[PDB]
Design an enzyme around this catalytic site. Sequence first.
Site, PDB file in Angstrom:
ATOM      1  N   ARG A 165      -3.572 -31.841  20.836  1.00 53.22           N
ATOM      2  CA  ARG A 165      -2.635 -31.986  21.986  1.00 53.22           C
ATOM      3  C   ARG A 165      -1.908 -33.305  22.031  1.00 53.22           C
ATOM      4  O   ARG A 165      -0.765 -33.303  22.613  1.00 53.22           O
ATOM      5  CB  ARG A 165      -3.367 -31.588  23.120  1.00 53.22           C
ATOM      6  CG  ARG A 165      -4.065 -32.699  24.050  1.00 53.22           C
ATOM      7  CD  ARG A 165      -4.791 -32.330  25.050  1.00 53.22           C
ATOM      8  NE  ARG A 165      -6.125 -31.898  24.729  1.00 53.22           N
ATOM      9  CZ  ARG A 165      -7.259 -32.860  24.735  1.00 53.22           C
ATOM     10  NH1 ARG A 165      -6.976 -34.180  25.150  1.00 53.22           N
ATOM     11  NH2 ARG A 165      -8.507 -32.590  24.364  1.00 53.22           N
ATOM     12  N   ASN A 166      -2.625 -34.217  21.518  1.00 57.39           N
ATOM     13  CA  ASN A 166      -2.082 -35.636  21.691  1.00 57.39           C
ATOM     14  C   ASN A 166      -1.439 -36.296  20.391  1.00 57.39           C
ATOM     15  O   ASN A 166      -1.441 -37.500  20.300  1.00 57.39           O
ATOM     16  CB  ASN A 166      -3.017 -36.685  22.448  1.00 57.39           C
ATOM     17  CG  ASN A 166      -3.211 -36.189  23.652  1.00 57.39           C
ATOM     18  OD1 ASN A 166      -2.345 -35.664  24.724  1.00 57.39           O
ATOM     19  ND2 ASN A 166      -4.625 -36.651  24.385  1.00 57.39           N
ATOM     20  N   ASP A 215       0.109 -40.325  24.081  1.00 63.54           N
ATOM     21  CA  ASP A 215      -0.686 -40.004  25.266  1.00 63.54           C
ATOM     22  C   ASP A 215      -1.757 -41.090  25.431  1.00 63.54           C
ATOM     23  O   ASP A 215      -2.908 -41.028  25.278  1.00 63.54           O
ATOM     24  CB  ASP A 215      -1.760 -38.612  25.239  1.00 63.54           C
ATOM     25  CG  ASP A 215      -2.362 -38.538  26.563  1.00 63.54           C
ATOM     26  OD1 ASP A 215      -2.961 -39.391  27.213  1.00 63.54           O
ATOM     27  OD2 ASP A 215      -1.870 -37.569  27.439  1.00 63.54           O
ATOM     28  N   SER A 225       8.081 -29.608  33.121  1.00 62.46           N
ATOM     29  CA  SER A 225       8.355 -29.875  34.510  1.00 62.46           C
ATOM     30  C   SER A 225       6.811 -30.095  35.089  1.00 62.46           C
ATOM     31  O   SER A 225       5.735 -29.420  34.633  1.00 62.46           O
ATOM     32  CB  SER A 225       8.595 -28.816  35.540  1.00 62.46           C
ATOM     33  OG  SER A 225       9.649 -29.411  36.340  1.00 62.46           O
ATOM     34  N   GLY A 226       6.437 -31.141  35.725  1.00 62.90           N
ATOM     35  CA  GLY A 226       5.291 -31.492  35.983  1.00 62.90           C
ATOM     36  C   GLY A 226       4.881 -31.991  37.595  1.00 62.90           C
ATOM     37  O   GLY A 226       5.801 -32.157  38.149  1.00 62.90           O
ATOM     38  N   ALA A 227       3.794 -32.005  37.916  1.00 60.60           N
ATOM     39  CA  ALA A 227       3.500 -32.216  39.188  1.00 60.60           C
ATOM     40  C   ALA A 227       4.119 -33.761  39.299  1.00 60.60           C
ATOM     41  O   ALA A 227       4.486 -34.369  40.379  1.00 60.60           O
ATOM     42  CB  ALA A 227       1.950 -32.178  39.488  1.00 60.60           C
ATOM     43  N   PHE A 228       3.474 -34.518  38.331  1.00 63.83           N
ATOM     44  CA  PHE A 228       3.952 -35.946  38.244  1.00 63.83           C
ATOM     45  C   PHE A 228       5.426 -36.201  38.310  1.00 63.83           C
ATOM     46  O   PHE A 228       5.796 -37.082  38.780  1.00 63.83           O
ATOM     47  CB  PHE A 228       3.293 -36.592  36.860  1.00 63.83           C
ATOM     48  CG  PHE A 228       3.932 -35.815  35.763  1.00 63.83           C
ATOM     49  CD1 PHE A 228       3.166 -36.013  34.544  1.00 63.83           C
ATOM     50  CD2 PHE A 228       4.720 -34.972  35.519  1.00 63.83           C
ATOM     51  CE1 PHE A 228       3.648 -35.366  33.387  1.00 63.83           C
ATOM     52  CE2 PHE A 228       5.222 -34.276  34.880  1.00 63.83           C
ATOM     53  CZ  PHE A 228       4.509 -34.419  33.520  1.00 63.83           C
ATOM     54  N   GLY A 229       6.151 -35.350  37.649  1.00 63.85           N
ATOM     55  CA  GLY A 229       7.604 -35.581  37.461  1.00 63.85           C
ATOM     56  C   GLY A 229       7.963 -34.484  36.301  1.00 63.85           C
ATOM     57  O   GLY A 229       7.362 -33.500  36.081  1.00 63.85           O
ATOM     58  N   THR A 230       9.386 -34.767  36.022  1.00 61.90           N
ATOM     59  CA  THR A 230       9.994 -34.166  34.975  1.00 61.90           C
ATOM     60  C   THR A 230      10.328 -34.779  33.645  1.00 61.90           C
ATOM     61  O   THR A 230      10.802 -35.881  33.941  1.00 61.90           O
ATOM     62  CB  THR A 230      11.348 -33.637  35.696  1.00 61.90           C
ATOM     63  OG1 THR A 230      12.389 -33.192  34.513  1.00 61.90           O
ATOM     64  CG2 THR A 230      11.811 -34.725  36.661  1.00 61.90           C
ATOM     65  N   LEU A 232      12.422 -30.720  29.052  1.00 57.95           N
ATOM     66  CA  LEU A 232      11.576 -30.446  28.185  1.00 57.95           C
ATOM     67  C   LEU A 232      10.186 -29.794  29.041  1.00 57.95           C
ATOM     68  O   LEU A 232       9.758 -28.694  28.478  1.00 57.95           O
ATOM     69  CB  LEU A 232      10.933 -31.608  27.428  1.00 57.95           C
ATOM     70  CG  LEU A 232      11.795 -32.134  26.566  1.00 57.95           C
ATOM     71  CD1 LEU A 232      11.078 -33.100  25.528  1.00 57.95           C
ATOM     72  CD2 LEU A 232      12.460 -31.151  25.688  1.00 57.95           C
ATOM     73  N   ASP A 262      -8.827 -40.581  23.822  1.00 62.35           N
ATOM     74  CA  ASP A 262      -8.502 -39.241  24.008  1.00 62.35           C
ATOM     75  C   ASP A 262      -7.641 -38.766  22.863  1.00 62.35           C
ATOM     76  O   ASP A 262      -6.438 -38.461  23.095  1.00 62.35           O
ATOM     77  CB  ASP A 262      -7.740 -39.021  25.275  1.00 62.35           C
ATOM     78  CG  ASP A 262      -7.569 -37.639  25.781  1.00 62.35           C
ATOM     79  OD1 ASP A 262      -6.893 -37.380  26.548  1.00 62.35           O
ATOM     80  OD2 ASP A 262      -7.884 -36.727  24.798  1.00 62.35           O
TER      81      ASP A 262
END
Lengths: 311, 9
Positions: free
Chosen positions: A146-147, A160, A25-30, A23, A142
């Site tokens: 977006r959430n 989120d 890709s992120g700095a945190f992970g995939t 879905l 939050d």
Amino acid sequence: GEAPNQALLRILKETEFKKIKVLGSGAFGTVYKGLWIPEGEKVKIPVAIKELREATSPKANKEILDEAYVMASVDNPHVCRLLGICLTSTVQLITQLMPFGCLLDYVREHKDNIGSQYLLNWCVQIAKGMNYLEDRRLVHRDLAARNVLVKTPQHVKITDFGRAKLLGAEEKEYHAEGGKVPIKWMALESILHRIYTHQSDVWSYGVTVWELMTFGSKPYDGIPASEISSILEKGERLPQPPICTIDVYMIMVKCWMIDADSRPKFRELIIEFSKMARDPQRYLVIQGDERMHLPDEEDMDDVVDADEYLI
Amino acid sequence: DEEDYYEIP
């Protein structure tokens, strides 16, 4: 004096699920789209899987488990439930697959095809989710378009929980220390004083519905976040969306009152939008409303939605 | 989106 939280944190094996596709890709992970096949149950469950980056800081993990802690302690049709986590070399968070993704993205891509009935229904569902959170004495902290995730165009869920906080039964307000924050969604009382309440969530609810009624417009665009606090103090607020009867807009405005106790309660919002949902075209004026229509693998035979998979 | 979150301190 609070009830013991007896929610179950389920530990899943990496063998129990196969990741079909990616879905994001992120700095945190995939984040992966995959199927969860609980061992010897003869069911397959569409899931979204976070697999954290190989280099994972001890803070990033301690932070992520809090989110899992919360997502596990929630049970409501309008809140993303978390199926379990996998303790591999990199931890994997496992949630119910929300195929249509972000509600914000969805309104942006489909604005032409979205009708008052859907919009109002969404407002209600989010209100129900948020109301449930209030029962659980939880403050999301939050809430934004977006959430909110889209399971089907007729069923959305809040998500989120990374910033979510819990209130001691005695506790009435939350005090926080500096971190990155969504200025343009925040109550004034939050920006000035780092104070969060169920009511500061209502404010954000206001902004959220405004995102939906503008089909994904950016709140206070063109004006810098450093300016927001001074502008709300002046009394300036977000403009009335074109499709919005004063009835609806009135309601948003109330969410953005300064006396937080003067703002509406999620249960009241549930009621108001729900009245409006009965006669949608009286409360939202959209061009072409009356005619809008809204809506893989072949291994589909045994597939069951997480919402029907109960433990 | 990242541009929505501002460092509060």
